[PDB]
Amino acid sequence: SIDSALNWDGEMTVTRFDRMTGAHFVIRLDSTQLGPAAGGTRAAQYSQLADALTDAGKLAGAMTLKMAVSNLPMGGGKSVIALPAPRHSIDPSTWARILRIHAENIDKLSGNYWTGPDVNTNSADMDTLNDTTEFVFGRSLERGGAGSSAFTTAVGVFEAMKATVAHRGLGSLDGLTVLVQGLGAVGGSLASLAAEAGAQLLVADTDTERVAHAVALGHTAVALEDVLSTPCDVFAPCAMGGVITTEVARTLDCSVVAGAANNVIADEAASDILHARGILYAPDFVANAGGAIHLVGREVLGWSESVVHERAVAIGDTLNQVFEISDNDGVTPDEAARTLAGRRARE
Amino acid sequence: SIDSALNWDGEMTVTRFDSKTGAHFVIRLDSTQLGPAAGGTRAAQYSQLADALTDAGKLAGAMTLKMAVSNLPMGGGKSVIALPAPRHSIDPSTWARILRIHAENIDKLSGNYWTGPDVNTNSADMDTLNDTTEFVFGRSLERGGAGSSAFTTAVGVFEAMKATVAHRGLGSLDGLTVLVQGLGAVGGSLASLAAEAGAQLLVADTDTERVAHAVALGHTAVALEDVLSTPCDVFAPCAMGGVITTEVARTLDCSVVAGAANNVIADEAASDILHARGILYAPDFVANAGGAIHLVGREVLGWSESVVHERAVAIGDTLNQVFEISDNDGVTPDEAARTLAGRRAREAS
Ligand SMILES: NC(=O)c1ccc[n+]([C@@H]2O[C@H](COP(=O)([O-])OP(=O)(O)OC[C@H]3O[C@@H](n4cnc5c(N)ncnc54)[C@H](O)[C@@H]3O)[C@@H](O)[C@H]2O)c1
Ligand SMILES: NC(=O)c1ccc[n+]([C@@H]2O[C@H](COP(=O)([O-])OP(=O)(O)OC[C@H]3O[C@@H](n4cnc5c(N)ncnc54)[C@H](O)[C@@H]3O)[C@@H](O)[C@H]2O)c1
Ligand SMILES: O=C(O)CCc1ccccc1
Ligand SMILES: O=C(O)CCc1ccccc1
Ligand SMILES: [K+]
């Protein structure tokens, strides 16, 4: 929206347009209070510019809280690339140009912002980015990066998922029905984990091959259009965000909500509804923090692979504290989560 | 439209919104090819955000040219602070907050952008900015800044007028009728120099004591509303920019245009009209370079005041060259000058 686009209260907004490629660049820094901002680089096609600005803004926020509640020394920031065409259609030469300019933009910030991979960006691109700028996390192992953080991400979400399931009074994942939306990098990892832990897997993905294979493995396919209406014990949104609107909140058929996506909840009211409906949601910003722990832990703090792994598992604990507060003070988890980040940031 | 405002070719646009003050902040970086971008801080009230945006960019564009054509090792940028109320209604407190917030943004660019005083901004505000950021030009003298660029600006503008008038075929400024619009820091001083050169002065200004004053000095005042309908030899727009519209370009009654204002031309066609009507125009980005010359010259280049002076004066020289291009090439002075800025830029590499 316009509010969310023009009247954003973050510390800085950076924009740029390239006539050559017709692409627009957005870099939103929400907070640099606890450290330089850091956030991925999402590249995607938006209906309107304002949608691009909105997204960069909501994500940047999530980043800020995510870093604070996870005890990372950094601020929240985010970069959005409004593509002129679908990522897959972009030609190599353009992709590269676009990447080049983006990198130029980061370099201007001079360490006030550090990027990494997000939707449609990868370790190879980071490497590419790194040819112009230094403010990059997630470059491939060969270039000196910590590489991909999906796994750390998925591990975090699994631990989180387990913590949520226990709290809700469902016992263990054993014999529970888990619905995974989005079988990507993280999504697909998380399914392996849950399956292995005794859960029945219901899966959905825009990608048929993805789906086909999960089916191969003994999973159950869900038509994209039956997703939000499909009964489960747990709902794992691991695809795009803004998935839970006020209307979805009142109709979802589950007891738990735990996934990897950023910004799952569209409106504040939705979050109240789930709550009111006896649906235990684990805050996205807590749950999906394994990727940040990984990049920051490794690249910034120099943590080994194990520590990072162990810190990501500790995500479950954070949740337990979140759950304790929400339960004590009578707030939603979301709020409860917001409360603990604030306390950890020592605000 | 914002979208449209966003369809700009600058290297970078920085924006921020301050809930508390309700102030919007803009920083447009046109080019950092010759060096860090630099340009003043304009504080004003905008109708829309898209407006502030278009301005900062228009201005940022002018700066890139001014640096280049003036043989300055810098790029161009401009900050625009969109006010939530008129400058005068802003409480010293809010203003200080706004300044600080301003200063943080600048800080984020870490040297890629150097600022200075512009409209509604002064040495003092620069001193304050300086409390937070270090990339400020035009700080008080005692703060270590080079102070006020006004007088150098006027000298430069002055020198340009003379050369222009001369090329026109008006000979000297002696006996001519000069119409000075806006007698601020710059115009005030220009009137003064024009006066002693023998010119006759018509003056105009919203400030009535400034007008009262010029009147007492022999000068003839002019009604605001009659500013563009007054016949003169030279028109010196020393207040707001974009005063030259297509419609105004066609009815203007003078033989030369030479002022201090940025973005005099409100439109392309206007420059063609004047050119075709035989009204000789000294391109703004060329003639108003006196201030950048001073600031950079002293604060970056470490130049002597005397040297800065020769350079501000050398502005005529550059205009002679501009004219020449315009005359041989068959182009408006506007075009002849961007060209020159273009050449100097390349040779400068
Ligand atoms: N470290 C991470 O990788 C990480 C960290 C934090 C949060 N997140 C969030 O996780 C989400 C993506 O995770 P990822 O990197 O594994 O993704 P990815 O880009 O590999 O995931 C794409 C997956 O989503 C699927 N998908 C897209 N739209 C879908 C839809 N409507 N229904 C079903 N499947 C759909 C694709 O087909 C594919 O399987 C985003 O919101 C991202 O911001 C991920
Ligand atoms: N270094 C400089 O000072 C500098 C350098 C480059 C270009 N310029 C350009 O020169 C102009 C002069 O600004 P300045 O720094 O001398 O500021 P200033 O505030 O001292 O001068 C503006 C003056 O013009 C008057 N004015 C404003 N609106 C008017 C109107 N509608 N009609 C008539 N007069 C009006 C004001 O009363 C004031 O006295 C600006 O447009 C600026 O963009 C100045
Ligand atoms: O948390 C996310 O969704 C993205 C993680 C991240 C963290 C730091 C830099 C880039 C991406
Ligand atoms: O020429 C101008 O518009 C103003 C002079 C200036 C130069 C460098 C930085 C700020 C202002
Ligand atoms: K169970």
Side-chain angles (χ1 to χ4, degrees):
Chain A
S1 84
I2 296 170
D3 202 56
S4 290
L6 323 150
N7 302 304
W8 185 61
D9 59 45
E11 311 194 342
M12 177 150 278
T13 292
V14 161
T15 49
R16 191 180 185 171
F17 174 67
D18 176 59
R19 207 155 282 117
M20 211 153 142
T21 74
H24 274 272
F25 309 74
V26 183
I27 300 175
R28 276 180 150 165
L29 302 195
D30 186 90
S31 166
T32 33
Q33 146 86 42
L34 291 173
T41 289
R42 177 165 290 206
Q45 253 198 119
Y46 288 77
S47 294
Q48 276 178 27
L49 215 35
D51 298 319
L53 296 153
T54 302
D55 219 15
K58 275 163 183 172
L59 294 155
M63 296 305 311
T64 283
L65 296 184
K66 174 166 333 191
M67 289 300 193
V69 78
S70 315
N71 278 302
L72 300 170
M74 308 261 263
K78 208 66 145 176
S79 282
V80 174
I81 304 181
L83 314 169
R87 160 68 177 103
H88 51 76
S89 301
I90 290 103
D91 106 87
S93 251
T94 301
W95 178 241
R97 184 164 144 101
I98 290 188
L99 281 188
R100 178 193 31 90
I101 292 182
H102 187 31
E104 292 190 336
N105 302 325
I106 302 159
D107 214 70
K108 272 190 179 80
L109 289 172
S110 339
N112 280 301
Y113 171 73
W114 293 70
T115 204
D118 205 88
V119 177
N120 297 321
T121 54
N122 60 40
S123 90
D125 290 336
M126 289 303 120
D127 278 18
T128 301
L129 267 194
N130 182 241
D131 298 320
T132 303
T133 198
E134 161 194 7
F135 310 124
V136 186
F137 288 150
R139 278 179 307 176
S140 76
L141 297 195
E142 304 90 60
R143 294 264 315 259
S148 120
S149 65
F151 192 69
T152 316
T153 298
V155 153
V157 181
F158 176 50
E159 268 315 309
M161 187 177 285
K162 300 197 290 172
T164 303
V165 145
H167 206 79
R168 172 82 177 56
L170 267 29
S172 48
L173 268 159
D174 191 32
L176 297 204
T177 292
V178 182
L179 205 167
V180 179
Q181 168 203 228
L183 289 188
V186 175
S189 289
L190 180 72
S192 234
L193 294 179
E196 214 293 315
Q200 281 312 128
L201 278 282
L202 291 180
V203 322
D205 202 271
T206 44
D207 179 19
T208 57
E209 192 136 78
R210 259 139 118 129
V211 195
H213 200 45
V215 147
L217 316 184
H219 309 312
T220 309
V222 175
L224 284 141
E225 90 234 26
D226 281 328
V227 182
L228 294 199
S229 105
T230 303
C232 54
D233 293 291
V234 183
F235 169 56
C238 306
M240 68 303 166
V243 141
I244 289 150
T245 47
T246 276
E247 248 354 275
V248 167
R250 304 196 205 257
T251 74
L252 253 191
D253 214 346
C254 66
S255 286
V256 167
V257 175
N262 263 303
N263 307 326
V264 152
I265 306 292
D267 39 68
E268 156 155 354
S271 129
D272 303 326
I273 294 150
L274 285 189
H275 202 65
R277 283 193 69 226
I279 302 178
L280 198 56
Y281 168 65
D284 35 27
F285 66 108
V286 181
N288 79 15
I293 280 145
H294 180 97
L295 292 189
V296 192
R298 298 240 53 211
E299 316 198 30
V300 174
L301 296 177
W303 279 358
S304 60
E305 205 123 359
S306 340
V307 176
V308 154
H309 298 155
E310 183 196 294
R311 290 283 172 160
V313 160
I315 272 164
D317 167 44
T318 305
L319 278 182
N320 287 145
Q321 323 193 26
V322 157
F323 290 153
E324 152 190 76
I325 300 164
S326 137
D327 272 355
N328 279 351
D329 300 349
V331 295
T332 56
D334 187 74
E335 240 181 285
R338 269 146 203 280
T339 264
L340 185 65
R343 284 184 183 170
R344 297 180 160 196
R346 348 187 51 234
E347 274 175 60
Chain B
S1 172
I2 260 336
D3 304 36
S4 240
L6 293 170
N7 261 66
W8 173 79
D9 288 307
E11 269 180 29
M12 180 183 282
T13 310
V14 170
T15 56
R16 191 182 179 167
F17 170 52
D18 176 42
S19 256
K20 214 172 116 171
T21 52
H24 281 259
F25 302 71
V26 191
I27 318 193
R28 294 197 131 155
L29 267 62
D30 189 87
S31 189
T32 69
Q33 179 181 124
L34 302 188
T41 295
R42 191 133 141 169
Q45 220 178 149
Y46 286 77
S47 249
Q48 292 161 90
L49 164 91
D51 302 20
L53 287 159
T54 100
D55 232 19
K58 267 127 98 218
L59 290 162
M63 302 290 324
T64 290
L65 287 169
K66 205 174 284 184
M67 299 304 198
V69 82
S70 309
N71 266 141
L72 294 178
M74 295 284 282
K78 214 83 193 147
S79 339
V80 178
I81 301 194
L83 306 165
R87 166 67 163 103
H88 48 106
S89 316
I90 296 137
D91 88 1
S93 262
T94 273
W95 181 247
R97 159 170 195 80
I98 277 178
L99 283 205
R100 198 192 78 226
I101 287 173
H102 190 32
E104 291 183 350
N105 301 358
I106 301 182
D107 219 49
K108 293 205 206 64
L109 310 193
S110 7
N112 281 308
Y113 176 59
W114 289 78
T115 191
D118 201 80
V119 176
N120 295 330
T121 82
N122 63 39
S123 265
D125 299 322
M126 297 304 113
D127 290 358
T128 302
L129 277 204
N130 198 227
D131 277 345
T132 297
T133 201
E134 119 154 82
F135 313 111
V136 190
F137 287 145
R139 252 143 352 126
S140 82
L141 288 187
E142 37 143 49
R143 232 298 210 345
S148 191
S149 48
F151 184 100
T152 313
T153 291
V155 161
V157 169
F158 178 55
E159 277 290 340
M161 180 185 294
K162 290 156 42 178
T164 290
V165 139
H167 205 86
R168 235 247 90 156
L170 310 204
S172 77
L173 218 39
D174 179 36
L176 316 135
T177 295
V178 177
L179 193 198
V180 184
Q181 165 203 235
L183 298 171
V186 182
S189 61
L190 188 68
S192 192
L193 322 142
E196 51 102 70
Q200 240 203 61
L201 315 200
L202 302 145
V203 292
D205 207 321
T206 27
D207 186 346
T208 17
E209 134 195 79
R210 264 209 151 293
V211 176
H213 185 174
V215 157
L217 305 148
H219 318 323
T220 322
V222 181
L224 279 186
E225 329 100 55
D226 284 5
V227 158
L228 306 173
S229 309
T230 297
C232 58
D233 299 304
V234 183
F235 182 47
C238 281
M240 6 52 83
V243 284
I244 299 163
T245 58
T246 265
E247 293 88 342
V248 172
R250 195 152 87 120
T251 64
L252 201 55
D253 226 332
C254 66
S255 296
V256 165
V257 169
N262 254 128
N263 304 325
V264 157
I265 323 283
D267 40 271
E268 52 338 61
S271 101
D272 309 321
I273 296 185
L274 295 172
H275 203 47
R277 297 211 10 244
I279 300 138
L280 194 49
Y281 164 62
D284 53 5
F285 78 78
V286 168
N288 77 27
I293 290 184
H294 175 81
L295 297 181
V296 178
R298 302 276 290 135
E299 288 203 56
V300 158
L301 298 171
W303 281 347
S304 106
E305 287 179 75
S306 95
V307 154
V308 154
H309 167 110
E310 305 168 9
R311 308 253 146 97
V313 158
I315 285 170
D317 177 50
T318 300
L319 266 189
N320 285 337
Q321 241 190 121
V322 165
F323 287 160
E324 154 140 76
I325 295 154
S326 162
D327 284 2
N328 301 182
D329 266 22
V331 298
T332 58
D334 197 74
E335 268 190 275
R338 287 162 175 196
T339 289
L340 174 77
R343 289 193 213 135
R344 279 174 177 200
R346 312 222 194 285
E347 288 146 23
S349 274

